[PDB]
Coordinates of N, CA, C and O and ligand atoms in Angstrom, one line a residue:
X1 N 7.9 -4.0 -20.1 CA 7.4 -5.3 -19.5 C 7.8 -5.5 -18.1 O 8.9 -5.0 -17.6
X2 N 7.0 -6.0 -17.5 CA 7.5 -6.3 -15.6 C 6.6 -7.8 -15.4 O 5.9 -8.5 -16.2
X3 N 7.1 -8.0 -14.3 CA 7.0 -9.8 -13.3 C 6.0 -9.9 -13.2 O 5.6 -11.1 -13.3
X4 N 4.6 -8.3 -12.8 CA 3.5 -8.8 -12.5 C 2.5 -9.7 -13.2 O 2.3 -9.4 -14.4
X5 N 2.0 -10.8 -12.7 CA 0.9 -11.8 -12.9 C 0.1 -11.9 -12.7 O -0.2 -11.8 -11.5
X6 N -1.3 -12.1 -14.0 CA -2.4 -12.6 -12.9 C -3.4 -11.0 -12.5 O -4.4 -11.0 -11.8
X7 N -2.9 -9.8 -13.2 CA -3.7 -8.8 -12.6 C -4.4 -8.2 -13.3 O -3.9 -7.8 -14.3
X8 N -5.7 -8.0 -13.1 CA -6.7 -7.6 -14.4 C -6.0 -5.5 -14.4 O -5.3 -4.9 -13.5
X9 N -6.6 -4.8 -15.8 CA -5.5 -3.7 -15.8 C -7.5 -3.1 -15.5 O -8.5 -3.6 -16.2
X10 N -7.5 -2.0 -14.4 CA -8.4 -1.3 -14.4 C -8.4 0.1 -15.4 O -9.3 0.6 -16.1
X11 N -7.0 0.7 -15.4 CA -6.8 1.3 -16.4 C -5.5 1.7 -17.1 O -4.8 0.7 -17.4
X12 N -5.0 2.7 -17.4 CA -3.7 2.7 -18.6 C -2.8 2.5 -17.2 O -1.7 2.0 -17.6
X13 N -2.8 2.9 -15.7 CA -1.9 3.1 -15.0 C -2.1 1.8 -13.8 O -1.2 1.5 -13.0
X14 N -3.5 1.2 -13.9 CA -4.1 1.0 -12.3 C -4.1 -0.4 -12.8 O -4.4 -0.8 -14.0
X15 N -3.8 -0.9 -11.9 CA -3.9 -3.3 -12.1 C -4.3 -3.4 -10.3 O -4.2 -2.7 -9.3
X16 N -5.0 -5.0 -10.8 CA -5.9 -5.4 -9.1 C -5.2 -6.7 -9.4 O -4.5 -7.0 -10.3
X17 N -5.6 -7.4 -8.2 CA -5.1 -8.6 -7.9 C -5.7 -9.3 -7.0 O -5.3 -8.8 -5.9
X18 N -6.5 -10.3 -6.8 CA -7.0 -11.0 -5.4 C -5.7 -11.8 -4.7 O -5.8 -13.1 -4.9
X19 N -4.5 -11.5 -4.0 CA -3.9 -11.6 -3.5 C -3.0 -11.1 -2.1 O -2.9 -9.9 -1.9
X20 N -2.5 -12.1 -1.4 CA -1.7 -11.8 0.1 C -0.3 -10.9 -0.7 O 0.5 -11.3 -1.6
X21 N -0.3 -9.3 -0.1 CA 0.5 -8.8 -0.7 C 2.0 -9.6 -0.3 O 3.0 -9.8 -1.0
X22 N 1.9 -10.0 0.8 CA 3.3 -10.4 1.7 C 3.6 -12.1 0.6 O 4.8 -12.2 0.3
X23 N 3.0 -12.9 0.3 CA 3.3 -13.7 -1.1 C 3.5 -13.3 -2.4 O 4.1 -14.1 -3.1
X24 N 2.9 -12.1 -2.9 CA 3.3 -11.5 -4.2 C 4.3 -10.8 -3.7 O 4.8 -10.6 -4.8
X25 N 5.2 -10.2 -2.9 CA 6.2 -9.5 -2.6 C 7.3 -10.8 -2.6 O 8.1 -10.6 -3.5
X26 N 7.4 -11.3 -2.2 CA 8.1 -12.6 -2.0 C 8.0 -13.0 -3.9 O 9.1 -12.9 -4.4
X27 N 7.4 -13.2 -4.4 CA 7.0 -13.7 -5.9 C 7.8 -12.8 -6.6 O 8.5 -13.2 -7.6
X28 N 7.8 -11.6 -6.4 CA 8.0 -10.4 -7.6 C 9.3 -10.0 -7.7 O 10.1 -9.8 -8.6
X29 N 9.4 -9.7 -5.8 CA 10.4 -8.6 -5.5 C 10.9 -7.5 -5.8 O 12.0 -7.2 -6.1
X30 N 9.7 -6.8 -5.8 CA 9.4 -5.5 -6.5 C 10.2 -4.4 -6.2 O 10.6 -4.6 -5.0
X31 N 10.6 -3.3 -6.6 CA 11.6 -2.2 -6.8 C 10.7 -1.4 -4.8 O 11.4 -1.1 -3.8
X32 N 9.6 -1.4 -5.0 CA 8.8 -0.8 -4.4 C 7.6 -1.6 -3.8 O 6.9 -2.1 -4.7
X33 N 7.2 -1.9 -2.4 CA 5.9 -2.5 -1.6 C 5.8 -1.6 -0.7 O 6.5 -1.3 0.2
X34 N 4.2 -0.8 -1.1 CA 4.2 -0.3 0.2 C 3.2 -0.7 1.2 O 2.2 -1.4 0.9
X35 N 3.6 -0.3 2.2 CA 2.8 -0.3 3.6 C 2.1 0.2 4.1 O 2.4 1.3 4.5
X36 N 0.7 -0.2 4.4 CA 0.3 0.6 5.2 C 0.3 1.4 6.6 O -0.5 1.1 7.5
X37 N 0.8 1.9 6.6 CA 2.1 2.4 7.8 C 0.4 3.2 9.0 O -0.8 3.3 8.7
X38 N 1.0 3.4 10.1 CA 0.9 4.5 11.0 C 1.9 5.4 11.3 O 3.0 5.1 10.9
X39 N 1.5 6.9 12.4 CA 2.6 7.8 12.2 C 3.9 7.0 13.2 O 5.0 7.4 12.9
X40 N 3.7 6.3 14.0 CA 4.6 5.7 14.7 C 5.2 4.5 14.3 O 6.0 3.9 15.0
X41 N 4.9 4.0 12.6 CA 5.3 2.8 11.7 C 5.6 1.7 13.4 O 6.7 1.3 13.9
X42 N 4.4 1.6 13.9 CA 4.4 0.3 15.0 C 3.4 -0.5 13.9 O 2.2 -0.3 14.0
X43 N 3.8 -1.3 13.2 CA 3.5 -2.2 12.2 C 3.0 -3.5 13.7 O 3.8 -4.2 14.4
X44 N 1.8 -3.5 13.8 CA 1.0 -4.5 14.7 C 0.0 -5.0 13.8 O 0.5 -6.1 13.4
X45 N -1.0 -4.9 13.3 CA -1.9 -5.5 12.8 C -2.2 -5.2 11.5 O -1.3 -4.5 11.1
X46 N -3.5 -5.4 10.1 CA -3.4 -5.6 9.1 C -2.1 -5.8 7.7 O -1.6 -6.8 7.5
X47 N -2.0 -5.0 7.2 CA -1.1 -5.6 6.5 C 0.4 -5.0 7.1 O 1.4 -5.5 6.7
X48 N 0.5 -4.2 7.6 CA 1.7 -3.6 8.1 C 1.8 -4.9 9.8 O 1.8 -6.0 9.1
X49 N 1.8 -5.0 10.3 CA 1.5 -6.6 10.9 C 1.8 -7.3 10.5 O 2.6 -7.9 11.2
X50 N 1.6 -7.8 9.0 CA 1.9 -9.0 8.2 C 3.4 -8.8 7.8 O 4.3 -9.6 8.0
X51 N 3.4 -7.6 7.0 CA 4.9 -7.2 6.5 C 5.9 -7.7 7.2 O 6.8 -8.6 7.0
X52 N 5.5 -6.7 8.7 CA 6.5 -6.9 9.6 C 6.8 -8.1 9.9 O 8.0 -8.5 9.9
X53 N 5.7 -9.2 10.2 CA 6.1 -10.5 10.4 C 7.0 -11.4 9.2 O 7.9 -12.2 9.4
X54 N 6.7 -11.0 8.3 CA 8.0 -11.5 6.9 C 8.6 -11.6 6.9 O 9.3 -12.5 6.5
X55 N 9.3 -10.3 7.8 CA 10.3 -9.6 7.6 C 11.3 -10.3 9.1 O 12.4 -10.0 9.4
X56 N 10.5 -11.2 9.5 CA 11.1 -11.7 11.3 C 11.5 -10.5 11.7 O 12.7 -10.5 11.7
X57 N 10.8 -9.2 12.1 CA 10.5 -8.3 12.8 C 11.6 -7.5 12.6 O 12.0 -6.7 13.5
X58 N 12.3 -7.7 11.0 CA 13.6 -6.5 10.6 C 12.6 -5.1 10.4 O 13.1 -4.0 10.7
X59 N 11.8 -5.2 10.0 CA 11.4 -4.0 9.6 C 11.1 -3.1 10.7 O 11.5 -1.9 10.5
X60 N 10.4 -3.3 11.9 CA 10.1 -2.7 12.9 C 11.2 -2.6 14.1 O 10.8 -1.9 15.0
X61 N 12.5 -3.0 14.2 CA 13.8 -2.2 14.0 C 13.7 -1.4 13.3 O 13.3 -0.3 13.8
X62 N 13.9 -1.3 12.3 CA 14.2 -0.6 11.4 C 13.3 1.0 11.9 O 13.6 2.2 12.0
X63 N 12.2 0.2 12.1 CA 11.3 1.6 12.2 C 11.5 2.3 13.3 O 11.3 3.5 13.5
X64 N 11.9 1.1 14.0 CA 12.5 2.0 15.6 C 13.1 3.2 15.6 O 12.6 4.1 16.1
X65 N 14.2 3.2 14.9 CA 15.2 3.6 14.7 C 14.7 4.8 13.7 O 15.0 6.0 13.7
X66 N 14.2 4.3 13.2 CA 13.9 6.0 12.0 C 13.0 7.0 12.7 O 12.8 8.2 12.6
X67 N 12.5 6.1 13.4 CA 11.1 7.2 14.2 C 12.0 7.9 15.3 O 12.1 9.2 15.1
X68 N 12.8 7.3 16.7 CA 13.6 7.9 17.2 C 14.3 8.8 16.5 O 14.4 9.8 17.2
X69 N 15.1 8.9 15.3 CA 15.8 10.0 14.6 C 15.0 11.0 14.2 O 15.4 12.2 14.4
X70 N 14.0 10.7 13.7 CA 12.8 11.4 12.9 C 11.8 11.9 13.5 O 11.5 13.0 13.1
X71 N 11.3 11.5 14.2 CA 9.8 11.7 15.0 C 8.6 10.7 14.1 O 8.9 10.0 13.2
X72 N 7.6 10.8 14.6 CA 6.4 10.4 13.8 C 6.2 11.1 12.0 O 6.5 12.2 11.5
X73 N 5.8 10.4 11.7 CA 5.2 11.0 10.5 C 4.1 11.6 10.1 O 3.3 11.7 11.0
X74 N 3.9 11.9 9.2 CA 2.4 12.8 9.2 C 1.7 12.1 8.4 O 2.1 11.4 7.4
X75 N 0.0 12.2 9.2 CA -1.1 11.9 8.5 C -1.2 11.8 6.9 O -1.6 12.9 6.5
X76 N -1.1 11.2 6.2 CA -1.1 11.4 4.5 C 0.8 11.5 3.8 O 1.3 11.7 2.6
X77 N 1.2 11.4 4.8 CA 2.8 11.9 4.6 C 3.0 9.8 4.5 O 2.3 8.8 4.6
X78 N 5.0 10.0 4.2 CA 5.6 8.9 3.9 C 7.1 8.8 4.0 O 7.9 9.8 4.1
X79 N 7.4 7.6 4.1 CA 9.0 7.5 4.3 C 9.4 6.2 3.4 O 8.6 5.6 2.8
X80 N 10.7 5.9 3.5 CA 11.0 5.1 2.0 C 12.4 4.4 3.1 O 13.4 4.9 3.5
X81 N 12.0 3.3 3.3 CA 12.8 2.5 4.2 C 13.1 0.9 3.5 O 12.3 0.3 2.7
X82 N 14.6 0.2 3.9 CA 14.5 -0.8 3.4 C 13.3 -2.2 2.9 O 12.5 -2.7 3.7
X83 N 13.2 -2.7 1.8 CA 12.7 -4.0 1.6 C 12.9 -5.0 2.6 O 12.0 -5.7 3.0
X84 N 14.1 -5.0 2.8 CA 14.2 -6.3 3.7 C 13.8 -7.9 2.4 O 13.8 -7.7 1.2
X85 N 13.7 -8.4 2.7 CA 13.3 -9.4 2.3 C 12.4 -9.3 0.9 O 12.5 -10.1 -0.1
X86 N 11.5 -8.3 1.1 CA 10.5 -8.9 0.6 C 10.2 -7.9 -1.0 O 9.3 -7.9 -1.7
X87 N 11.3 -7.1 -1.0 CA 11.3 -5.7 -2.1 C 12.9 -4.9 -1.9 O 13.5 -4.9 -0.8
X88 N 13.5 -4.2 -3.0 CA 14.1 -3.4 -2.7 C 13.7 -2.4 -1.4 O 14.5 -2.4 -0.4
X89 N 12.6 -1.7 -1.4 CA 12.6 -0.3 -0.7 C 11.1 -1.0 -0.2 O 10.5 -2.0 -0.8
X90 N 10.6 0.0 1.1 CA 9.6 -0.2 1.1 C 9.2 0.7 1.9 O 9.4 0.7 3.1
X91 N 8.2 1.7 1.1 CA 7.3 3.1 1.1 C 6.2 2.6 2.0 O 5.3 1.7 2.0
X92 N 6.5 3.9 3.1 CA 5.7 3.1 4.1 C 4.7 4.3 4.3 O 5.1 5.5 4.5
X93 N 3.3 4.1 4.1 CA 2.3 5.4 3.6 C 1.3 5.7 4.8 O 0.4 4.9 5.0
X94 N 1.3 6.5 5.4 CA 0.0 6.6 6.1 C -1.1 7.3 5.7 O -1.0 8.6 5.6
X95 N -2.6 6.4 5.5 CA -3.2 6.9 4.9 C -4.2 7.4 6.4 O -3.8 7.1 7.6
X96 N -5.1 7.9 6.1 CA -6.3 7.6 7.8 C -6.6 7.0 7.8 O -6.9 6.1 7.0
X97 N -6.6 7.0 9.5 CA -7.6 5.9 10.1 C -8.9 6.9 10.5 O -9.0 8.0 11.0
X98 N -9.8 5.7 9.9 CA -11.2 6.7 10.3 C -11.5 6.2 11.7 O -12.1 7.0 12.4
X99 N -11.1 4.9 12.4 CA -11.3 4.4 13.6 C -10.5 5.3 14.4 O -10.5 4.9 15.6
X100 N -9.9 6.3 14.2 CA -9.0 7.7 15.0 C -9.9 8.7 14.7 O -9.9 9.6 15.5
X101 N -10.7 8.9 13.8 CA -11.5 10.0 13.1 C -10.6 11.0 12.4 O -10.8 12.2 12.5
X102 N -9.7 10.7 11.7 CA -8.7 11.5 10.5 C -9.7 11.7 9.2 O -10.7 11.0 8.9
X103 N -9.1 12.6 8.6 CA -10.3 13.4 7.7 C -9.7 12.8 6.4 O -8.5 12.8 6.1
X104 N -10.8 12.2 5.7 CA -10.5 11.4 4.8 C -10.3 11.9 3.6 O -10.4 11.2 2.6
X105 N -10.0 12.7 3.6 CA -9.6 14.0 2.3 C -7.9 13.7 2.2 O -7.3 13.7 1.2
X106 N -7.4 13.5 3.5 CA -5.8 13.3 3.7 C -6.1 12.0 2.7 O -4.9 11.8 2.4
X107 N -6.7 11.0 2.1 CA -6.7 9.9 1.8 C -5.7 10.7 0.1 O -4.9 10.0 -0.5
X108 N -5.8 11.2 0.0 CA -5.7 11.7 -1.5 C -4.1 12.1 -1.3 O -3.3 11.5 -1.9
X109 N -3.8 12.9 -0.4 CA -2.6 13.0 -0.1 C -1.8 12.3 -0.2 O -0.9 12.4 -1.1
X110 N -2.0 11.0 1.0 CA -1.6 10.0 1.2 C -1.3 9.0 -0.5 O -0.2 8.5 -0.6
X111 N -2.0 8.9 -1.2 CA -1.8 8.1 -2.6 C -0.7 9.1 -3.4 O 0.2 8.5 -3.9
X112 N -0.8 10.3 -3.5 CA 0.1 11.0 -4.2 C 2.2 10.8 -3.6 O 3.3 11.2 -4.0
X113 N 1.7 10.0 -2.4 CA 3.5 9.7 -2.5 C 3.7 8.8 -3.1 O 4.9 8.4 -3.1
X114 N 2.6 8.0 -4.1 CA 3.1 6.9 -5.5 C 3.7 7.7 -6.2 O 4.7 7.3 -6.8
X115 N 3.3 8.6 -6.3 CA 3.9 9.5 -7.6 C 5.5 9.7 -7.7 O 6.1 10.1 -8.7
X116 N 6.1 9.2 -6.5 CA 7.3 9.5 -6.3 C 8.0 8.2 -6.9 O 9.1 8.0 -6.6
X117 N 7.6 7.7 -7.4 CA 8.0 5.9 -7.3 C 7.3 5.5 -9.3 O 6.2 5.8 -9.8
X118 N 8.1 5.0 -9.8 CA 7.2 4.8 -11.4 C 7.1 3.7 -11.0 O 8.2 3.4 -11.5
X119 N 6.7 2.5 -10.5 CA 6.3 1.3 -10.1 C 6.1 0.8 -9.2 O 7.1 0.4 -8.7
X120 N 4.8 0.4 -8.5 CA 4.5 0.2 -6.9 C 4.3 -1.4 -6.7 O 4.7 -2.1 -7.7
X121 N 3.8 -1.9 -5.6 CA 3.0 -3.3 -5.4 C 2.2 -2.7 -3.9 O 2.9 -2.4 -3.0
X122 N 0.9 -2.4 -3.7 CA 0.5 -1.5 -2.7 C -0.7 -2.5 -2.3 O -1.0 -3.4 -3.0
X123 N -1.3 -2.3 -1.1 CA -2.8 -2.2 -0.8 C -3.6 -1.1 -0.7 O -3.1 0.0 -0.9
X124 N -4.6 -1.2 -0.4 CA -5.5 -0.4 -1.1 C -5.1 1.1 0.5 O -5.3 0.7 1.6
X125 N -4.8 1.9 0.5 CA -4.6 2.5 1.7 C -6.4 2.7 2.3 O -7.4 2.7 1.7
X126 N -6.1 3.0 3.7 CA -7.4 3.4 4.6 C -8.2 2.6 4.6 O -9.3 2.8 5.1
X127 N -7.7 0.8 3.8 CA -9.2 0.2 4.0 C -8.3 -0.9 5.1 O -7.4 -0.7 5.9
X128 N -9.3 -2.2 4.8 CA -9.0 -2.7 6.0 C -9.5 -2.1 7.7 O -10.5 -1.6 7.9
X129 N -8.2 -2.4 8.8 CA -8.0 -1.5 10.0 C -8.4 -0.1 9.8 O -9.2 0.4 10.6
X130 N -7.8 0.6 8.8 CA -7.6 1.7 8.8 C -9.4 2.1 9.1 O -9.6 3.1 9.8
X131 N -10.8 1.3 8.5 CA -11.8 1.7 8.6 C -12.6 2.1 7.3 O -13.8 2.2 7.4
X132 N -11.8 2.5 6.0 CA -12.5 3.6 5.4 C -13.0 2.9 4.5 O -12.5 1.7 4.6
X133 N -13.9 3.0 3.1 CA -14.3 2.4 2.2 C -13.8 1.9 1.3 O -13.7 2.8 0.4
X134 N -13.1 0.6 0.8 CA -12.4 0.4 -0.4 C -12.4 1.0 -1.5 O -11.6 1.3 -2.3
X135 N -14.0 1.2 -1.2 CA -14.5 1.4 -2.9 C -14.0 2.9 -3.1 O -13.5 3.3 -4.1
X136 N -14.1 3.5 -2.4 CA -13.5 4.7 -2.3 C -11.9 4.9 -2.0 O -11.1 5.7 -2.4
X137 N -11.7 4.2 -1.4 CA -10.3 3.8 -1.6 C -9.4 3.8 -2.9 O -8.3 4.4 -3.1
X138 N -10.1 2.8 -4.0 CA -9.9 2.5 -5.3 C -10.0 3.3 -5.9 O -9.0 3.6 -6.7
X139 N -11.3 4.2 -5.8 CA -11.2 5.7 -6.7 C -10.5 6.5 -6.6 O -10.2 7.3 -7.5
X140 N -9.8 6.4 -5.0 CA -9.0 8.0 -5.0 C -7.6 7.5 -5.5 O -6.9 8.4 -5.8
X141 N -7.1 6.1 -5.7 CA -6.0 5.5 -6.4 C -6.1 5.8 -7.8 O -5.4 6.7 -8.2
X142 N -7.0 5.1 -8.6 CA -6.9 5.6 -9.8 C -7.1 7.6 -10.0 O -6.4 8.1 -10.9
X143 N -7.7 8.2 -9.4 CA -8.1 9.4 -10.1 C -6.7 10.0 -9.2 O -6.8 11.2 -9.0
X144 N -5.7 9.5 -8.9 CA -4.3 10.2 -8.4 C -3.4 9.7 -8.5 O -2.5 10.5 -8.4
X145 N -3.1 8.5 -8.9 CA -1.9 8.3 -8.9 C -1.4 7.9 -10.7 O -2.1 7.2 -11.4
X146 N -0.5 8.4 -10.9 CA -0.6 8.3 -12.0 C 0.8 7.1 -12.7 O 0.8 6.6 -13.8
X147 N 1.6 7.0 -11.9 CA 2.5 6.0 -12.1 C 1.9 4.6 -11.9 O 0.9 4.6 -11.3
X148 N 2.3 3.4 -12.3 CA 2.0 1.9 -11.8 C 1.9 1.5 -11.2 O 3.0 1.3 -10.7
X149 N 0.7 1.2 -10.3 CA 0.4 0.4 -9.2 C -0.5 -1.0 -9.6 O -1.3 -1.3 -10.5
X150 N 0.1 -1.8 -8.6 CA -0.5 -3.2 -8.9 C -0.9 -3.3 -7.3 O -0.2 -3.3 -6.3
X151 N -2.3 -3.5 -7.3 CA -2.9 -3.1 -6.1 C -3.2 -4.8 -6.0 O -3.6 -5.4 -7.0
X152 N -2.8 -5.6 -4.4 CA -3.4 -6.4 -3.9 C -4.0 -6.6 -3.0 O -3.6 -6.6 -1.8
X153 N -5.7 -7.1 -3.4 CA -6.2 -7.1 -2.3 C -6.6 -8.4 -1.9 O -7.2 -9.2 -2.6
X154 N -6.1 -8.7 -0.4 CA -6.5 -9.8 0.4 C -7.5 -10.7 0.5 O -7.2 -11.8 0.9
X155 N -8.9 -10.4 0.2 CA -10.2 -10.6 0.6 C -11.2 -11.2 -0.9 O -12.1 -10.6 -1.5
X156 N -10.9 -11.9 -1.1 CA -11.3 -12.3 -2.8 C -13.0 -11.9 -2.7 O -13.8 -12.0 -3.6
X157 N -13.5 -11.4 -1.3 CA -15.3 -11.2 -1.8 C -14.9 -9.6 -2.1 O -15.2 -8.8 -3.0
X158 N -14.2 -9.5 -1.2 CA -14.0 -8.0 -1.6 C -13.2 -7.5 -3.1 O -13.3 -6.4 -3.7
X159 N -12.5 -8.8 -3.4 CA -11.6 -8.1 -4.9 C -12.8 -8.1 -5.7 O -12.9 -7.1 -6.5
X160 N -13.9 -8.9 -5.9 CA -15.0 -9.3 -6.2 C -15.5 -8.0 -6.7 O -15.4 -7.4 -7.8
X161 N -16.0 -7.6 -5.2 CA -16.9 -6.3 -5.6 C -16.3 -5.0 -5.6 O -17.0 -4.0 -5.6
X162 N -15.0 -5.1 -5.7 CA -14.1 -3.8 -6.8 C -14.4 -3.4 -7.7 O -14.9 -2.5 -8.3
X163 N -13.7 -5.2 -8.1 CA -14.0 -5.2 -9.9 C -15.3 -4.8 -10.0 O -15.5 -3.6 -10.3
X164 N -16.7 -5.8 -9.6 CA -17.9 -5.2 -10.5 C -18.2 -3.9 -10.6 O -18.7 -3.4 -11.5
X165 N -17.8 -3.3 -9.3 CA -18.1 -1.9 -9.4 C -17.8 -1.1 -9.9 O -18.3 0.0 -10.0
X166 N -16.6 -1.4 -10.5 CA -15.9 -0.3 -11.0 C -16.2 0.5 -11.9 O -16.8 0.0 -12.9
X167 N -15.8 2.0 -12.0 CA -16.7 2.7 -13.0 C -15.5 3.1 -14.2 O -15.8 3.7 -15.2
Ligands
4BL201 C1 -6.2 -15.2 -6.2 C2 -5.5 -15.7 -7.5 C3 -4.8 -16.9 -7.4 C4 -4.2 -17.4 -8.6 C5 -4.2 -16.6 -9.7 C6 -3.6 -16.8 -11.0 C7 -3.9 -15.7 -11.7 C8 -3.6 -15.6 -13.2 O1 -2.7 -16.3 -13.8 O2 -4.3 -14.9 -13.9 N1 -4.6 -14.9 -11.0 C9 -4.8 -15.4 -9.8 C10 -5.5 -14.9 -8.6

C-alpha cells in the first residue's frame, strides 16, 4: 500500500492523475519525483521550471554544481539528485525535445531509467515543452516501464483524452 490518491490504475504497473505534479509532491513526498530535465538540468520552463521554483531555486544549485563536476547529460540518459523539499531524491530524466529535432526513439530510453527506482511520481516525458505527443508519450510509459509510476498530468483536457484513448 502507498499515499497515492485519486489515481485511476491504467494497468498492473501504470496510474494517471489530473494534477500539478509540484502539489502532489508536496502531498505525498514521494521516495522519487522526476523531472523533466534537459542535458544542462537549466530547469527554466515547463515542469522542470516549476520544480525548480518549489524548490526556491535549491535545485538548480544543485544542478549547477553537478553539471560543472559532470558535464551535461545525455539525450534519454539521467541523474538522481536531491528532493529538496518536495521528495526524497529527484530523478531528473531527459527525454527529447522534438522542438531541438532529437529522435524520438530516445523517448523509450529515456522511460527505462524508471526501472531503476520501484516507485516514481513522474510527468509524462517529451510532452509539454519538450513538443512530442502525449499520447505517445503514455504508450511508451506503459509498454517500458515496468516498476510504479503515478503519472501526473497538468492539463485536465488533456488527462481527458489519455484516459479515453487509451488502449
Ligand atoms: C484534479 C483532481 C482533483 C481532485 C481529485 C480528487 C480525486 C480522488 O479522490 O479521486 N481525484 C482528483 C483529481
Amino acid at each position: 500500500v502507498n499515499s497515492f490518491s485519486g489515481y485511476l490504475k491504467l494497468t498492473d504497473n501504470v496510474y494517471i492523475k489530473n494534477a500539478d505534479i509540484v502539489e502532489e509532491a508536496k502531498k505525498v513526498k514521494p521516495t522519487v519525483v522526476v523531472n523533466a530535465a534537459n542535458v544542462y538540468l537549466k530547469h527554466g520552463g515547463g515542469v522542470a521550471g516549476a520544480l525548480n521554483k518549489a524548490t526556491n531555486n535549491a535545485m538548480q544549485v544543485e544542478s549547477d554544481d553537478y553539471i560543472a563536476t559532470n558535464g551535461p547529460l545525455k539525450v534519454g540518459g539521467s541523474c538522481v539528485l536531491s528532493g529538496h523539499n518536495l521528495a526524497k531524491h529527484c530523478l531528473h530524466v531527459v527525454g527529447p525535445n522534438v522542438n531541438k529535432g532529437e529522435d524520438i526513439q530516445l523517448l523509450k530510453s529515456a522511460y527505462e531509467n524508471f526501472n531503476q527506482h520501484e516507485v516514481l511520481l513522474a510527468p509524462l516525458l517529451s510532452a509539454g515543452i519538450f513538443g512530442a505527443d502525449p499520447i505517445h508519450s503514455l504508450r511508451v510509459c506503459v509498454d517500458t516501464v515496468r516498476t510504479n509510476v503515478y503519472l501526473a498530468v497538468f492539463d485536465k483536457n488533456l488527462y481527458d483524452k489519455l484516459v479515453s484513448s487509451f488502449l
